[PDB]
From Swiss-Prot, chain A:
Subunit: Component of the U4/U6-U5 tri-snRNP complex composed of the U4, U6 and U5 snRNAs and at least PRP3, PRP4, PRP6, PRP8, PRP18, PRP31, PRP38, SNU13, SNU23, SNU66, SNU114, SPP381, SMB1, SMD1, SMD2, SMD3, SMX2, SMX3, LSM2, LSM3, LSM4, LSM5, LSM6, LSM7, LSM8, BRR2 and DIB1.
The MPN domain, residue ranges: 33-162
Protein name: Pre-mRNA-splicing factor 8
Function: Functions as a scaffold that mediates the ordered assembly of spliceosomal proteins and snRNAs. Required for association of BRR2 with the spliceosomal U5 snRNP, and the subsequent assembly of the U4/U6-U5 tri-snRNP complex. Functions as a scaffold that positions spliceosomal U2, U5 and U6 snRNAs at splice sites on pre-mRNA substrates, so that splicing can occur. Interacts with both the 5' and the 3' splice site, as well as the branch region. Has a role in branch site-3' splice site selection. Associates with the branch site-3' splice 3'-exon region. Also has a role in cell cycle.
Lineage: Eukaryota, Fungi, Dikarya, Ascomycota, Saccharomycotina
Subcellular location per the Swiss-Prot or TrEMBL entry: Nucleus
Comment, domains: The MPN (JAB/Mov34) domain has structural similarity with deubiquitinating enzymes, but lacks the residues that would bind the catalytic metal ion. Contains a region with structural similarity to reverse transcriptase, presenting the classical thumb, fingers and palm architecture, but lacks enzyme activity, since the essential metal-binding residues are not conserved.
Miscellaneous comment: Present with 468 molecules/cell in log phase SD medium.
Shown part of the complete sequence: 2150 to 2395 of 2413
Curated annotation (Swiss-Prot), chain B:
GO molecular function, one term: nucleic acid binding
Locations listed in the record: Nucleus
Gene Ontology CC annotation, any one: U4/U6 x U5 tri-snRNP complex
Domain of life: Eukaryota
GO biological process: mRNA splicing, via spliceosome; spliceosome conformational change to release U4 (or U4atac) and U1 (or U11)
This protein's name: Pre-mRNA-splicing helicase BRR2
Major subcellular site: nucleus
SEC63 domain segment(s): 225-535
Domain Helicase C-terminal positions: 1-148
Further comment: Present with 1440 molecules/cell in log phase SD medium.
Curated annotation (Swiss-Prot), chain C:
Shown segment, full-protein numbering: 338 to 978 of 1071
Keyword Hydrolase: yes
Catalytic activity annotation: ATP + H2O = ADP + phosphate + H(+)
Residue span, Helicase C-terminal domain: 198-376
List of residues binding ATP: G36, E37, T38, G39, S40, G41, K42, T43
The protein, known as: Pre-mRNA-splicing factor ATP-dependent RNA helicase PRP16
Lineage, highest ranks first: Eukaryota, Fungi, Dikarya, Ascomycota, Saccharomycotina
Protein's job: Influences the fidelity of branchpoint recognition in yeast splicing. This is RNA-dependent ATPase which is essential for viability. It may mediate one of the many ATP-requiring steps of spliceosome assembly and that accuracy of branchpoint recognition may be coupled to ATP binding and/or hydrolysis.
Amino acid sequence: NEWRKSAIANTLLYLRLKNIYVSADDFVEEQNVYVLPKNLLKKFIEISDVKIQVAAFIYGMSAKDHPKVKEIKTVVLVPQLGHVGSVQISNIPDIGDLPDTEGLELLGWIHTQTEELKFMAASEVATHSKLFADKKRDCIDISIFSTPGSVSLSAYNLTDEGYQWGEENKDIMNVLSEGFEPTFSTHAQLLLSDRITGNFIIPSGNVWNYTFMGTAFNQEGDYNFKYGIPLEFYNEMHRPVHFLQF
Amino acid sequence: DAGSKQILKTEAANVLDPSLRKLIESGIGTHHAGLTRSDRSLSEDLFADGLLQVLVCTATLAWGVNLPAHTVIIKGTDVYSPEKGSWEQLSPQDVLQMLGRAGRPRYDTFGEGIIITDQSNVQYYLSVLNQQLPIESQFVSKLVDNLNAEVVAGNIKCRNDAVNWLAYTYLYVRMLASPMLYKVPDISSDGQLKKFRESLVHSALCILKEQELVLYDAENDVIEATDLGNIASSFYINHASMDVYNRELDEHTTQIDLFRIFSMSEEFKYVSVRYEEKRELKQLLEKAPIPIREDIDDPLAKVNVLLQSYFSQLKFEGFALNSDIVFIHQNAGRLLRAMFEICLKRGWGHPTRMLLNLCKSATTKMWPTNCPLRQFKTCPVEVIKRLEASTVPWGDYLQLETPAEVGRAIRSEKYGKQVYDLLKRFPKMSVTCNAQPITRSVMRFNIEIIADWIWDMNVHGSLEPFLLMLEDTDGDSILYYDVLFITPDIVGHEFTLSFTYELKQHNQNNLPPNFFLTLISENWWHSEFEIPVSFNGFKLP
Amino acid sequence: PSKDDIKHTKEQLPVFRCRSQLLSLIRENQVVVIIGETGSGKTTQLAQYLYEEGYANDRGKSIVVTQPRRVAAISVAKRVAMEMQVPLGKEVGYSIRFEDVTDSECTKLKFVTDGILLRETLLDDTLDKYSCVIIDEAHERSLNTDILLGFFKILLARRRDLKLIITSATMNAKKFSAFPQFTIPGRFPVQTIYTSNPVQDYVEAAVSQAVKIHLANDCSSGDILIFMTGQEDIETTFDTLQEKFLQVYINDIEILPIYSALPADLQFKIFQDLHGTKRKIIIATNIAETSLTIKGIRYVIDCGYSKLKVYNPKIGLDSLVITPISKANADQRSGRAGRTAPGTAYRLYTEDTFKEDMYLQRTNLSNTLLLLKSLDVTDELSKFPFIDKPPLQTFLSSLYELWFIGAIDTSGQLTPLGLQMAKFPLQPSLSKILLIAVRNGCSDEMLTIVSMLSVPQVFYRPKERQKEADIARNKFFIAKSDHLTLLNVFEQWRANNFSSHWCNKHFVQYKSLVRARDIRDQLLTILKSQKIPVISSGKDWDIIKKCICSGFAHQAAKITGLRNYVHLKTGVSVQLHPTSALHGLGDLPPYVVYHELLMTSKEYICCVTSVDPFWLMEY
């Protein structure tokens, strides 16, 4: 029962949202800006763990006003298996056959972490390449540094050196740390907005957190999906096993 | 030995299972509940027929049965009050019920009643059995709760209604007659206790107003009925408990908190963790499925762990504690409901949804994370275990419309045809919903529903009720609700619902992508069906 | 008392510390994945714990089995019977090719080879009444193992009520995740060396001699357990070692060879204890790689090579091929060393060590495609979430092979022939020929021959012994056919039952006769279960040997002089195997069908059978 302590902790995780910090630099109208609806952030943290990483894809689309303002519309939460400092994510979901999905782009992923950095780390780069290397290269990464008190958002692109390096690393160990570069990643323009509201898409089975089911986690699984309200990380459904002891 | 023994020892063998039989061979029976229905009926009937000389009883015999004996002995008069969290003396009515067994009226010339107790008590039980313990009113102790219920029934608006009401109480008839006992100030001034009545009513009302069960203006003298007081009356909840539910229940209230809030109820004020049971209790508190923030010193931890146990039907050794737990389930139901009622009124989507399960969980004596084949009383014990361990989604089993197919998933042939029949008896809905903007601010929602189960009277009763909510995109804000009662004439055929909801200003300026519309069985696990309600192309006028 | 002593003993083993966490996880999950050290208990004790936690809260269960090899099935069945104080046919029982000792129906636990449970999946495409399989030695990537995954993943998506288990001591955690893990900490340690110059020709008999002198200068009492690739390098290395000892030097050492083809008593001598100062120096193949507990072994070695069997689809050519082992084989070998005391391993591992290079775990997928399409796992094979299927190339060979066999229709969906064949624990070519042998009314001789072209070698050949003895060749009598030597041997064996003595007197390998028997009666019983007419009935030896041409059906030969050959797949030049009946003569019909084509230092053709021009021309 390491989790019991974490599970109790996650109840107050809503208080971290009185302190929301977004990484900013000089606005460049030559490159994109990603708009993340504030409600999605609030929820995504509310369902996250304090220690273990939690991740989702983001889908959105450009407005007419500016083709370079990509509004994020939907966060797709998918079967996955979290760890401290890394997360194993299933493949890009097929959501084509859902309603209102007319002309969404897959813009990238978004995830929690417990180490504040100014650059994409090595598990990030491994996973970012795993997911997007051969599929869609411009996919950003929105990294959320979540810690007692606050959350701090940070958006990155990955360079091709990054991708290549990530392709080389099928696996990542605690100690190996071979060939890594902080310059692999570049600041991407993120704006949090409260004037658009986005929504969730969750697996049809409803469970996204295969920690306590790590045998059944299919990392190339062809899964089904629906619009819906995502479960919390230590939600009873993510823990069939604990109700067996009792 | 010749007459009885063959007639006894025939009968002694046949239905007797436990250690009861080695007692019955000796002509003495035992009789309690939680004993085989045939086994206790033998006891009654052998004792009735002269063959047992001695039946040893728990108190139920005294209310349940008509089984007299010449002699009745109360061994001991110590009883455990779980309510009071403590050992106590037999109440007078229990002793008088027990003694009503003494003496067979048709046969016996007379009857004998023996009480056995500490000398301290003897004087007391003397008075009880000899017409000298007076009947006196306790109406003040429950005055606040009972006043509120008439306020809620709308028979009280001004506090003169209250002092009239009190005149039809026993308290009142009894106060007039022994004002010193009831601590009246001065009957001669007060006459028929008009100022006393008014004063009780006042103090009562103020503590009610303090807790938001009522609205009160002393100066004006208007009594008014809150929605919260209206729950307290309807679900028979202690005012203090409504207070705790008021402060503690939150938009961000969580499963782990609910168990705590539940355990905070006035109903469980006296629950204490006694020294001996503490070792066993710690064993359960660390295998607890929902985290307990509270210590094992704390009483709240006990009530919490006990309730979690009832949901898992845990076997308990200690008698003390097993009585305690029983006390909890018989209240758990209507407390958890009162909690649910508040959250639904207040709009909090997520705790409302969770409370509804706890309510289910306390009816069905099982947790959410269990396939409801276990919910059909009429399923075998092995078959579900194979459907739980596998991990195939619950709903997944439901989709198959072929009786052979369902049997292949089970991996049993004959259980596969009977479970197909059960499956078709599991409640399910179809929901469609479009929306129509009436004005800019006002949206009408038009819903069409089909109920898809085949009715069985043993399995569904007269009706199966269904909560319908329309909730915001976050899934945190209940925007409309209504309860649908499905009945055997309703299943299979389509119907329509319409309602309006007034969009908040935020959403008026930028429509959200969607809302949600959800139907949940009040009774049947994992029969929830929700659909998104798009606003995709929409122009608000 | 003896059973309460067995309990006490069980409760000291490392896996007992986890037994409740384990039992919960299984009960709660379709799937599992035990991981735990070599000797930890995983075998013996997991299926005990499952049976027990039915039997001790009023329930019953079933179960099935632990691992891949015949000797493991039988041996750890006999163990677990002793750890119950029961005879084998109560709650024990095994099932292997040619040997079965059934359990009661109900409680009871069912210890089998992989291939046998695949055959039983014909009578249950659901594998039901079986609560709880188990998993044994999953990291032995055999085609049967990998087939029975595909079928079990699909079954568990049908029938959640079922329970799996997985289990090894050496296994990729990441790979398992891709395809609840439970780690069992605790054993003895095994100190591991790596040779330190290119191990390039890996019976560097110099490396071998010098290592055995070093591990005799350390005065550490224990037995050595070399691992070698086949009977050739076992007999050369052992013989060479003996020669060196006479030249360099029994009353200090006994060499003992261990291969599936040696007499069953010689096999049992590996586990026996040698006189006083005599060190025992096993030279074994991969049959000693997994499960076993040769008490006395302190000191492995490991030449890092195995004996693979290597199809090519486009030309239809099989071949034996000495190949680098995989990291999993290396780990299992080393695990033989620290089960009963601290040990060493001596990985002769440098070149194709490159240990990094050494593949973690290479096999034709056709059998596993049939299981993916007979459990209805039905997207397609190449969107099965394997692990592997690895290469796309080998996937499309298997789909094309099933298509041409008429196991698959125009839509990629199974035919009735394909469904039946997916239920037989054979090659599907051999399953096709079996159905032709059930029409004809020749099923029982075809069943013997199909089982025999899926089993260990049948004759015993002493050490360097360049050929059969002329008694064994006069088990073919007239007809130049390995397949009929092995029938005449099997007929006669089935009568004797004084049968260790019969085997000895005719130089035959007792546990290949028993395995072949068991395989034959399983394939017959699965036939009958799938609603078929058997019999045998007339000049069937001719119709039967003909049918062999369609069960091994690119494997046709010529004869172009003494011990020289000529594969009728465009003219390539091969040798009759030195074990064959037909290992020398002029004979009568110059066309042979064979069971294997085996790369060595030449290509060689294995179990042969002469077949007339009409037999080759119309099957």
